[PDB]
Amino acid sequence: HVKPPQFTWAQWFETQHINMTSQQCTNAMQVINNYQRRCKNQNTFLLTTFANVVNVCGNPNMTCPSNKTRKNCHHSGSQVPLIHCNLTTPSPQNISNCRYAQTPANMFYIVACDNRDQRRDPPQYPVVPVHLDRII
């Protein structure tokens, strides 16, 4: 996974998975895609707060289903409302014209968390989410 350089991993997590800037996937995805310079095939927005995800980082460590040598993952405990956005119409030379479907659900999630970026993440949160590993 890669991010634009002005973001820490936690900031990028928040941009991709928390700050759904419209309740409509096509609009919300414009932000992510404009930053990544491509249309993502799929993306999940969790209808939860960043603070709530930080607190999930405090749940017991577990193996990450997507990256099995990693043990920095944490299960949400409870289901949360979320929205899955799926690309319906690619437009790689004009990202603004990508269109998405959306699928609401209530599901558990598994997040990878790490120590914050020393220089650029706020000291408020020593431990931050960095990857949305799995939805279940």
Swiss-Prot record:
<feature type="glycosylation site" description="N-linked (GlcNAc...) asparagine">
    <location>
        <position position="94"/>
    </location>
</feature>
<keyword id="KW-0944">Nitration</keyword>
<dbReference type="GO" id="GO:0005576">
    <property type="term" value="C:extracellular region"/>
</dbReference>
<keyword id="KW-1015">Disulfide bond</keyword>
<feature type="binding site">
    <location>
        <begin position="40"/>
        <end position="44"/>
    </location>
    <ligand>
        <name>substrate</name>
    </ligand>
</feature>
<keyword id="KW-0325">Glycoprotein</keyword>
<keyword id="KW-0458">Lysosome</keyword>
<keyword id="KW-0456">Lyase</keyword>
<dbReference type="GO" id="GO:0006935">
    <property type="term" value="P:chemotaxis"/>
</dbReference>
<comment type="subunit">
    <text>Interacts with and forms a tight 1:1 complex with RNH1. Dimerization of two such complexes may occur.</text>
</comment>
<keyword id="KW-0255">Endonuclease</keyword>
<feature type="disulfide bond">
    <location>
        <begin position="64"/>
        <end position="73"/>
    </location>
</feature>
<comment type="function">
    <text>This is a non-secretory ribonuclease. It is a pyrimidine specific nuclease with a slight preference for U. Cytotoxin and helminthotoxin. Selectively chemotactic for dendritic cells. Possesses a wide variety of biological activities.</text>
</comment>
<protein>
    <recommendedName>
        <fullName>Non-secretory ribonuclease</fullName>
        <ecNumber>4.6.1.18</ecNumber>
    </recommendedName>
</protein>
<feature type="glycosylation site" description="N-linked (GlcNAc...) asparagine">
    <location>
        <position position="67"/>
    </location>
</feature>
<feature type="active site" description="Proton acceptor">
    <location>
        <position position="17"/>
    </location>
</feature>
<feature type="glycosylation site" description="N-linked (GlcNAc...) asparagine">
    <location>
        <position position="86"/>
    </location>
</feature>
<dbReference type="GO" id="GO:0035578">
    <property type="term" value="C:azurophil granule lumen"/>
</dbReference>
<dbReference type="GO" id="GO:0005615">
    <property type="term" value="C:extracellular space"/>
</dbReference>
<feature type="glycosylation site" description="N-linked (GlcNAc...) asparagine">
    <location>
        <position position="19"/>
    </location>
</feature>
<dbReference type="GO" id="GO:0002227">
    <property type="term" value="P:innate immune response in mucosa"/>
</dbReference>
<keyword id="KW-0540">Nuclease</keyword>
<dbReference type="GO" id="GO:0016829">
    <property type="term" value="F:lyase activity"/>
</dbReference>
<feature type="disulfide bond">
    <location>
        <begin position="25"/>
        <end position="85"/>
    </location>
</feature>
<keyword id="KW-0145">Chemotaxis</keyword>
<feature type="modified residue" description="3'-nitrotyrosine">
    <location>
        <position position="35"/>
    </location>
</feature>
<dbReference type="GO" id="GO:0051607">
    <property type="term" value="P:defense response to virus"/>
</dbReference>
<feature type="glycosylation site" description="N-linked (GlcNAc...) asparagine">
    <location>
        <position position="61"/>
    </location>
</feature>
<comment type="similarity">
    <text>Belongs to the pancreatic ribonuclease family.</text>
</comment>
<feature type="active site" description="Proton donor">
    <location>
        <position position="131"/>
    </location>
</feature>
<dbReference type="GO" id="GO:0070062">
    <property type="term" value="C:extracellular exosome"/>
</dbReference>
<dbReference type="GO" id="GO:0006401">
    <property type="term" value="P:RNA catabolic process"/>
</dbReference>
<dbReference type="GO" id="GO:0004540">
    <property type="term" value="F:RNA nuclease activity"/>
</dbReference>
<dbReference type="GO" id="GO:0004522">
    <property type="term" value="F:ribonuclease A activity"/>
</dbReference>
<feature type="glycosylation site" description="C-linked (Man) tryptophan">
    <location>
        <position position="9"/>
    </location>
</feature>
<feature type="disulfide bond">
    <location>
        <begin position="57"/>
        <end position="113"/>
    </location>
</feature>
<keyword id="KW-0378">Hydrolase</keyword>
<keyword id="KW-0732">Signal</keyword>
<feature type="disulfide bond">
    <location>
        <begin position="39"/>
        <end position="98"/>
    </location>
</feature>
<dbReference type="GO" id="GO:0003676">
    <property type="term" value="F:nucleic acid binding"/>
</dbReference>
